[model samples]
Target chain A: PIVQNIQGQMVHQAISPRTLNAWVKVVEEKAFSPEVIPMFSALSEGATPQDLNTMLNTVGGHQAAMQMLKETINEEAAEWDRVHPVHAGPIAPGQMREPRGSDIAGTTSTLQEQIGWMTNNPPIPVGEIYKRWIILGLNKIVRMYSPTSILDIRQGPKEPFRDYVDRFYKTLRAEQASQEVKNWMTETLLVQNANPDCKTILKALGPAATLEEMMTACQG
Target chain B: PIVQNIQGQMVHQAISPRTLNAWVKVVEEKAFSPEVIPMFSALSEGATPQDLNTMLNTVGGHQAAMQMLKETINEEAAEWDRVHPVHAGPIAPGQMREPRGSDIAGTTSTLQEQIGWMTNNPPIPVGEIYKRWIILGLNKIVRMYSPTSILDIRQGPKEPFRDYVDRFYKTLRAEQASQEVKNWMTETLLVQNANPDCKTILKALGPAATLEEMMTACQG
Candidate 1:
């Protein structure tokens, strides 16, 4: 049904859950190089391609980047050491290390290292940048829906009530919000975005406590 | 601290939650054209630029695409009518329609219309395509972690246990998997992927019931 006719031939198509699922399997199974790994890492971590390019160009090409990073961490850690001369003890026995400068600096450097590592990589190809996002979208297909996915779950104007409710439930189960947040999101979305029939059911049923209850009422 | 020095100056930076938060606000607050709307709709739904380009090329340029689409829907609906002649009754009064052909065909036509509408639009710009993905990724940053997001939360080889645990918790609370699956994931990931200190806590404490308990043990 995603395929549509154009010029009297069925040539156009949209991405389906199956296709997106296939791509996810491909990405998970395939081993990637350092170059490709971090690009998707950035994308999944909410970085733009422009952000990747700018950071890559800025700190990526420097000759003494690590040295400068070391100096910055040391300077900051030294100040931290001055304020909290004796730091809190470690979580376990024999885990504590001397010199708060190195310990604190080490933490900062690890963060710096991750940034530096991502920065060291070349800019991500436009062709491949969306792959991480594709994986993300595909996961939502299986899991309970994200509350933030307001636009994704909004029932289409001409969509069947059954079809829309099915979709709404799929994403709703996977949502990770507080129970209160979930209630707010679902009740509002169901009332506001659903077709006329959904409203009729609600009016008759008098505020169904759960979406499941609401769904059963609709089917009945 | 995402800022790094380049050319003896701090000019380059990776995106932080704060910066991404600002961008999310900007996008949410901003009004968009129909042109921009579906492009993001496609992106979040896992349609690549190449896919967008191809679908647009296939059906978008045609003059009689809609007529062909209508004919196709009508043919299919006629077939559906033969199989289920006297369909199930409507949900309520006045909900019944005259013909099965039109009813079945209407559902198909709505789908066809959506596909045709997307295909009819111009290709999305490279600059803007990633915004939806960014919004998606940002949502993950706030909500529970997706089970599919293995790479995003894998502890850095050099990362501090404290920092890693904090990052892990932020995403983990939002994971959408069943309890059994969550146990399997947390136990395996904690031992296999976590820093050495995490293993020490796990070995001493005997496998944590929850990631929260694990976090508490690690911090203690």
Candidate 2:
């Protein structure tokens, strides 16, 4: 018979319910302490290790369990890096640094704030929800750092006025330019590139007091 | 009175239900064409734009709307880059490359496979769940690229045999070492550094045929 070591057996059973059951047994046998078990149990009333083990035997349950494990591993590694600082070699310009805990913490808070009113009646794990929010949130920040200038705003030939304005607005929102600069640039782009009909109509409407006024005049 | 342009108004109402309602109205008004609306409607039974509009009036619903929009923007931008490729500046050895479309596609497939058994009974948007899976999935790939080597494995002096074995197995699984190399290393490590009782017991048990036999003999 083929013989596999405990470690090799685990590797083979990485995605199997058997491995999950073994983990549960390990916990029950006090192989690993119950430091985190109370927190897990707190999620459900008087939950036993076996109850969770059984649940994890299902396909979706296994996926969720693995996802949670991966998340915890990442979190723990990050936390470990925090206390044990190891900065090696000279960093050149544009080299990305490890994500700061402060920034990640802020991102987490923002995600929580954004989704605070959401009702998750699904079997989807809460950790999964947070992961998605974090991905989008971090991605937004990354794009913001390498933002496109408002100067790039242009009404593509044959593009509708409504479409042009929407695209322009999104570009404007992404700009790192000052409010005052954006104010002037907005007017400059509108007048310089706007369709002839829109410009003439805006001209008749007279100088607008605010951006909204100009938009209304142009659309009208 | 303070005047806000359509863009400015959007900025002001960024987190409000009114903005979401406005977006719904925009789609209803046909100011922007319905290229993507069909996909949204397909998610539920004869889901009208008005139905989604009413849903977005809720706090969580608004968050979900913003998240979906963000995901779409990212996806579009990535697609645009694929059609119009632009590579600028000299990249250093450690400078990270932009994530490739192929890699991202693979990541998405992996995520879908892992969670194929999941049931989303909650009000949580599908996009949000995907974002989470994507984040974790991409992160795993990133970690794998900068993996810890098997040479880094060391049996802690006071670490229990079971605990040490578990750690050893995890490290072995993570290594990019060849099967042959790993096989030899596994044997060497077991005999050389296994706990005093484990080493002597294994010596008396004679040479084991496989890794599993050694592990069983050590534990026995």
Candidate 3:
């Protein structure tokens, strides 16, 4: 079962002290940010009273820093143009998702933005930077940033056109804020398409039309 | 012992087919340029005799194209500068060497040149491109691209400076057709340095000395 360590980080209960200390040793040579030194020293083989005090203070700071980052994203996301993470790539098997997950999921571009932020403001140790890297290394995030990712959501094999268009909306949330937006929404239709009638929708919305409006025009 | 495969690329017998065939399937899903198709088709597990016939013809073309690329680098390399690879990273154990290896291997600039080559000219299937990537992944190549790679060839634990200068020369073969050639030769003296006399030599050279001439001036 998953539980919080003394440091208050959530992880598996099976993770032994031996494993944690060994990892701490491996990271010994790495230059860590000053804030996390308490945690590492506490986790090392001979944990003294001073080490525990240091760890407790540092861990508190880390939790606060993490809370700030989450709040920052929650506040900043609406101001930013967004992309669907799924169109970036397949989700890894064991990962969880929020409904309309891309809002929190972040895109290929958003991940790049996150990494840049982390690098510019390295609040954690070298180890946590690696931990953060894995969290951010979602395929969905990668595809969102990738220049070549075609809008690949499908209506599905033999599914009706209405259902397909709905599927397209679920994934086609990337905002370019101008004419180029249609290319993401419409150009995939022009490609040897998943839905044959996709071309008809393009014909209906010829030049510089909105994807949402086109969906409404086609729907009822 | 080093070995060659059926395709005539060098590697252990166990890895080529396994690695080559696997990467082919992945790249098959990817959109490679039209020029590389015959090579992929030839390497696939399901290849027909007819596919091999086409592959054989194309293989001849690819080898000639590869030769042309080699000549392009050979001619171009003479015009460019070089840097020691060790500054970039450690060399891989037991890798092959060029018959007359460059003393000061170019690392920082060379890695960039390599990435450019890989992107611009993807080779047959997953094989030769990957093979070449391994050959170039060595420390010398890495340092060729690294900006932070200083000339840190050690002067031994507490030894004298004479052997250290010779050590610097063995790996410091970067060139200059211009008036500023001595900058690579003796800049470390003015910059943070390994040998203490390097700046003293800089005073001896007084400004604008040839790297070859600086070496002689510093010694005896």
Candidate 4:
């Protein structure tokens, strides 16, 4: 619920990944035109609109996510203190079974150190990568379920929205974001994840199917 | 009359003072307007054609007087040489009382020195310093004579004859003869005949007198 609240705040602040992707599309479309339009062609190919959008999302999302984690830890510390009261005088370590001041300090220090590391180098959003994996996994899942509903859902949307959503899902089949996000997640999270498997599936698909076709198959 | 011959040769060669004055007059009359003719105009103020003619006469008369001196000195030298002759062999000093080779050589050297000096320091003729002296001296000599006929003779029928005489007179005044003749007169004759009274008369007349006025004054 706290993570949901944090996500809402991020959306309000125009810091969400979806909002960043929208900005990236707007900037890309505007930049490709001959005459420069303001608020669009400000970034060059070297500093692409998509790259800017990714950087903003990563930095802002990591900060918001860490703040949520820190608030949760603090709330847990307060609840533990209310449930287990401490004695005024010093007691023998064997006599007192409850956690001591040093224990609290030690626990807080360990969590603070982990959070500090994440603050310094945050975990890359595995959710986006997992989302791509899920789309690719959907092909196997749809074979077990009904694939017709998935295909029908994709074709239902209006003009640009349908096209844009199709394109977004197509990007997942190609695993462009997953490949990029995998590298980022590996470095930031310091872990190997399901994103690499998604990359393998996208690579096996080759260029036989158009991105939209592959994405539709994956989504199904 | 070696000096007279040299003077005639000089006049024939057109290096005479009268010729030089005539040349100066030509340059003045042709190259310049009346307003620009320097010394000639300064001497004869408001000088007309008649004044220019008179100026030429004075220049010619000075030459004639110099030619007379040249002739007289040459005649005296010839007469002396006629009276004295030497044998082929060297004789005793008393046997040949005339000037020896060394004496002649010394006189020649002295003349040469004087001529060299005059040639180096050519006096300004337009300044009329020497002309004034010659005119005044001749004037005094004319005054001393009972019948001065130097100016008594009128112009002859022959324009050529008059011109030839005028040129001859010019040759002497201009010192356009042999170096020996010029040296002898300048060193011996002119040096010996430096009259203070003549100088005073020249100074009194200033540079204003015309050629004819100077000549007529010379024949006082």
- Which candidate gets the maximum DockQ versus the true structure? 1
* Model 1 stretches astray by more than 4 angstroms: A1-95, A98-153, A169-179, B1-220
RMSD of each: 31.1, 30.7, 26.3, 57.9
Give the winner by TM-score.
2
Go through the candidates in order and give each one's C-alpha lDDT: 0.42, 0.43, 0.35, 0.33
Looking at candidate 1 chain B, the ten consecutive residues that score lowest on lDDT are: B1-10
**B83: Cα error in model 2, Å:** 55
Mind giving the per-residue lDDT tens digits that candidate 4 earns over B71-175?
443444455456655456676752323342222212333433322222333311221322332233333333333232322323333323223234323223322
Order the candidate numbers by TM-score, best to worst.
2, 1, 3, 4
Q: Per-residue lDDT of A63-98 in model 2, one digit per residue for the tens?
A: 443455445545754764587575789876643444
Docking class of 1: incorrect
In order of lDDT, best first, we have: 2, 1, 3, 4
* Higher-lDDT candidate of 1 and 4: 1
Q: What is the TM-score of chain A alone in each candidate?
A: 0.34, 0.33, 0.28, 0.22
lDDT tens readout by residue for model 3, A41-63: 33433322222222222221122
TM per model? Answer: 0.22, 0.24, 0.20, 0.14
In model 4, which regions exceed 4 Å deviation? A1-61, A93-97, A100-220, B1-220
User: Model 3's lDDT to the true fold?
Assistant: 0.35
